[PDB]
Ligand SMILES: Cc1ccncc1NC(=O)Cn1ccc2ccc(Cl)cc21
């Protein structure tokens with residue numbers, strides 16, 4: 238019992254974190270096999286960020302200009318290439334701590350763990366969600382660039398995010414491990430406003446199922462609804478539209494609890510229309526949307 | 542920017558987790574040097590839990606009855622002893638992944654990270670606080686016993702908690718690494734109700750300072766208060782009394798923000814008396830009390 242915002246164990250990713258310095262800029266790198274991945278803005282000065290021409294800036298850089306330090310030892314850089322917004326630094330030594338891994342590009346609403354690092358050293362781990370506006374609400378300071386987001390399935394680490402920047406509104410933007418930004422963000426110090434941060438409805442329903450499994454049942458009502466009726470309410474509250482795909486993904490939670498998905502939708506509808514009335518659900522006074530149905534099943538079954 | 546419930550990186554603790562089986566009971570063990578620490582109820586059957594005599598039960602156990610598996614390899618048990626509510630299993634091999642460590646007994650209000658494990662394997666990491674009633678609001682299922690709580694200062698892991706049980710109310714009870722329970726709990730399947738779960742006032746104030754540092758300032762008011770006036774309000778709301786020791790610990794946050802501790806107390810007083818009025822602070826609709834002043838400074842400065 239109990240339901241917590243849980244992150245994946247971070248050891249497998251800690252063994253990959255390195256420090257990358259180019260000139261006067263130091264950020265984090267991810268060392269997998271004989272390649273170190275890092276944000277391409279490591280080649281920039283803060284002045285360059287206003288309007289950087291990365292191909293032109295990169296011409297003035299050689300293998301020896303990229304200083305890569307793993308723990309306290311220096312890695313020898315034998316190649317460097319730019320792939321979208323990330324630099325790939327080929328080193329002469331394969332990372333002995335390389336776990337089994339994949340690079341995946343996640344969709345909005347999907348959750349992942351972040352290992353926040355500074356100077357190649359881990360500071361902490363927390364759980365995030367890729368927002369519907371393709372930002373993440375992380376906790377990052379200057380020097381955190383290159384910190385990565387990931388999921389783990391038994392022994393395989395699926396890297397899904399690399400941190401690049403903070404928007405003027407304090408939210409965060411970054412890329413997948415192929416260097417493609419999530420959303421329309423660009424790695425330049427320019428006006429980049431985020432779109433509407435809508436609520437991930439399917440995750441809120443998953444979290445309502447987690448609450449029922451853990452004993453918080455006060456919000457269960459005598460009503461049901463339809464996908465179309467629910468979605469009218471969800472539109473009004475800036476909630477993502479619920480699809481039959483989402484209903485299907487909630488199937489196992491519906492089966493475990495004996496509460497039909499549409500009945501839970503009706504509970505969520507009343508919660509949206511009437512609020513919590515000073516009450517809490519899983520220790521929260523708001524509707525949590527950063528647990529997917531898979532995270533709920535995982536945490537409620539104890540997958541390791 | 543951004544403020545998250547952040548856990549310590551868990552790698553150093555993952556390298557210590559082992560599986561301990563005695564008869565038909567399997568739980569987690571913590572392997573440090575040549576000793577494996579685990580809850581003493583590993584020697585019990587579920588029937589034994591109603592009224593166990595641990596010294597008597599332990600007499601029927603020999604070194605070979607404790608099966609300790611680290612990853613997929615078996616550790617040889619050359620000694621076993623009971624220290625309070627934990628068993629110490631001396632093995633013939635020192636854990637090669639033993640980090641620098643200490644055993645500390647924390648006080649209520651102090652926070653720590655939990656590496657939840659099942660069958661000696663890590664499932665996730667989350668941040669906890671030792672409640673004022675000496676329970677923890679964790680996320681643990683059957684088989685999680687032996688999962689540990691810890692803090693890290695650069696390279697030293699301070700182990701502070703080992704999970705033992707869930708109370709009938711879904712809250713959790715456990716010991717320090719010397720086997721002494723936090724609070725008045727005993728390792729027996731008996732009626733154990735928890736005392737009042739009061740709010741950790743000093744942590745709420747630390748989190749209000751974190752909110753100001755991150756831009757959430759709507760709750761700052763034109764008022765001040767005194768320790769005695771504040772404490773009258775704190776009593777009314779089941780908040781822990783604020784001492785001059787707590788004011789002193791908040792000093793660095795007061796200095797960074799330029800907001801006197803008593804002025805922040807007055808903001809907290811109005812928040813208690815008037816509620817949030819449907820507004821949020823650091824994405825929360827309630828007053829968060831599981832960040833200490835040290836956690837706020839740490840996260841807001843980027844200590845690794
Ligand atoms: C300071 C901080 C806090 C949290 N997370 C990241 C950062 N760092 C930055 O944002 C660095 N940086 C500055 C201008 C700019 C433009 C584009 C890009 Cl990609 C990076 C940029």
Ligand SMILES: Cc1ccncc1NC(=O)Cn1ccc2ccc(Cl)cc21
Pocket residue numbers: 238582590681682683684685686705706707713727728729730731
């Ligand atoms: C099931 C579960 C979920 C979460 N956290 C822990 C557990 N396991 C237990 O509580 C096991 N167990 C059962 C009876 C009893 C009495 C005393 C003690 Cl020490 C352990 C006891």
